[PDB]
């Protein structure tokens, strides 16, 4: 495979569609591409391409580096684009399957060469478009299941953080121990019944004191 080679006419359409936006796209014609490409137009195109592929602000191409040391910063504006183009374009065109891009191509664009470079860029743009679809699908499968692990740590650490008589017994036990008796609760509707020997007293036909005395006489 070498990449498909568009004719100038088709190159304008693809650039309008994918690279140049609004007024910049509208103004593009075959004329500023062939037979004498226009450096200013090509600069615009390469900058846009780089901004799309790498995410680079247009600003970044017009930046005056720190202790520059230049006499007249403002006489420098025409040169600035170039400096920043070169470095990125050396890396980017190989990716587009172009291996013979040279600074002359930025400074003084030739017809047949820039046509081939533009097709290289355009074809890569279509390919990544296809790659974007599948990447984004994968990036909503993993980041969505990351949301399902946020909620799975919300319900797990909350329910891990929630997990993170000595007066009535001794009174009721002394009765049982010192007397050595226990009631049967089958004491009819009135009588008293229990075990010590079996104790069986009527209580309707017996005094309270008689019952007390009979119980303590066995202790």
């Amino acid at each position: 495979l070498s990449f498909p080679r568009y004719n100038v006419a088709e190159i304008v359409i693809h650039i309008r569609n994918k690279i140049l936006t609004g007024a910049d796209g509208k103004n593009l014609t075959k004329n500023d591409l062939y037979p004498n490409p226009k450096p200013e137009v090509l600069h615009m195109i390469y900058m846009r391409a780089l901004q799309i592929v790498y995410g680079i602000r247009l600003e970044h191409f017009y930046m005056m580096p720190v202790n520059s040391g230049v006499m007249y910063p403002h006489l420098m504006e025409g040169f600035l684009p170039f400096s920043n183009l070169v470095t990125h374009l050396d890396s980017f065109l190989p990716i587009c399957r172009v291996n013979d891009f040279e600074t002359a191509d930025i400074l003084c664009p030739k017809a047949k060469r820039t046509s081939r470079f533009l097709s290289g860029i355009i074809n890569f743009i279509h390919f990544r478009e296809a790659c974007r679809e599948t990447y984004m699908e994968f990036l909503w499968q993993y980041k969505s299941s990351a949301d399902k692990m946020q909620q799975l740590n919300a319900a797990h650490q909350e329910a891990l953080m929630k997990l993170e008589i000595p007066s009535a017994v001794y009174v009721a036990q002394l009765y049982h121990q010192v007397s050595k008796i226990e009631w049967e609760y089958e004491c009819e509707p009135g009588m008293v019944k229990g075990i010590h020997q079996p104790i069986h007293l009527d209580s309707t036909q017996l005094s309270r004191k008689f019952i007390s005395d009979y119980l303590w006489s066995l202790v």
Partner: protein
């Protein structure tokens, strides 16, 4: 930026431009002797050597065509974005008294370009307008896909696998690691509902057994006539055989 903001008539201004030219050559290894004296009025020959040297920093291994230098040099300046025209004839007379001031200015402008370039070489985007986040990763993937596509395709499973692996690490999520906590956090919820049931059976088995031990306490207090927190010792008046003998 036409206009000439530069006072090309000021001898001090030119001499200073000459000095920069001199300094840059001497300090960046120009192979030929230069000095303030030798740069007051260079020949076309020496000029062409100096220019070839300087432009060399922007176009490595540049050499000028053996003919039509009067056209090349100005064209080169134009393409670099030099705001002021260099006439075909000034090229023929570079070091002459009405020419050198204009040329040396151009050279000093060329030196600034070089300084700019030189700098943006030593000192050296993960969000995209399409909506791609982690662009460096996506680029890495797209590039690898393209190279494969380059050769044979039309599958990118090596790439998709590697991408999947990198996404696993970046997010720490697996179809297993998510599922593991799914039953792991469900396991303690039933256990919590079960620990709730112990504490719920502990409330009814306490309030019913304390209501049952009080009735037995009343039954012992009535039968034996003994209260602890005595009766029936022939009075039923409040107060064993030591109490019965009094």
């Amino acid at each position: 930026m036409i206009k000439d903001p530069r006072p090309l008539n000021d001898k001090a201004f030119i001499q200073q431009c000459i000095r920069q030219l001199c300094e840059f050559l001497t300090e960046n290894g120009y192979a030929h002797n230069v000095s303030m004296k030798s740069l007051q009025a260079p020949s076309v020959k020496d000029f062409l050597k100096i220019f070839t040297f300087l432009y060399g920093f922007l176009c490595p291994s540049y050499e000028l065509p053996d003919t039509k230098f009067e056209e090349e040099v100005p064209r080169i300046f134009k393409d670099l974005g030099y705001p002021f025209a260099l006439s075909k004839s000034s090229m023929y007379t570079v070091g002459a008294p009405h020419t050198w001031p204009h040329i040396v200015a151009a050279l000093v402008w060329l030196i600034d370009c070089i300084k700019i370039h030189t700098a943006m070489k030593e000192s050296s985007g993960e969000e995209t307008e399409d909506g791609i986040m982690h662009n460096k990763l996506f680029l890495d993937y797209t590039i690898k896909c393209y190279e494969s596509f380059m050769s044979g395709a039309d599958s990118f499973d090596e790439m998709n696998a590697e991408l999947q692996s990198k996404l696993k690490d970046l997010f720490n999520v697996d179809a297993f690691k998510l599922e593991s906590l799914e039953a792991k956090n469900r396991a303690l919820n039933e256990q919590i509902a079960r620990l709730e049931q112990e504490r719920s059976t502990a409330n009814k088995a306490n309030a019913e057994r304390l209501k049952r031990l009080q009735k037995s306490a009343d039954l012992y207090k009535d039968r034996l006539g003994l209260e602890i927190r005595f009766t029936n010792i022939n009075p039923e008046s409040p107060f064993r055989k030591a109490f019965t003998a009094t």
